[PDB]
């Protein structure tokens, strides 16, 4: 399965999705800079509308514990 095919379900906790992401990211062998680009970009983009909304409110500069606690009730 390709990294672009990794997406969050409509009922799937973000948490279970983030695990899937760094597992597939774990099978990507690209430069770190590209993998940083993938992190800030693709993760949020394939996140579900309800959490996506939430993550837009965190702004930039956000870290994984704060994202992970931010989308917990969703």
């Amino acid at each position: 399965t390709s990294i672009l095919d990794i997406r969050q379900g409509p009922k799937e906790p973000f948490r279970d999705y983030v695990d899937r992401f760094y597992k597939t990211l774990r099978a990507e062998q690209a430069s770190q800079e590209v993998k940083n680009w993938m992190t800030e970009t693709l993760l949020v983009q394939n996140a579900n509308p309800d959490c996506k909304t939430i993550l837009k409110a965190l702004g930039p500069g956000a870290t994984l514990e704060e994202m992970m606690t931010a989308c917990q009730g969703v």
């Binding site: 948490r15 983030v18 695990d19 992401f21 760094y22 597992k23 994984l64 514990e65 992970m68």
Partner: peptide, 12 residues
């Protein structure tokens, strides 16, 4: 293997 969100948080 597994717990890759945590493994990334640790790395960082």
């Amino acid at each position: 293997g597994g717990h890759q969100a945590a493994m990334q948080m640790l790395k960082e």
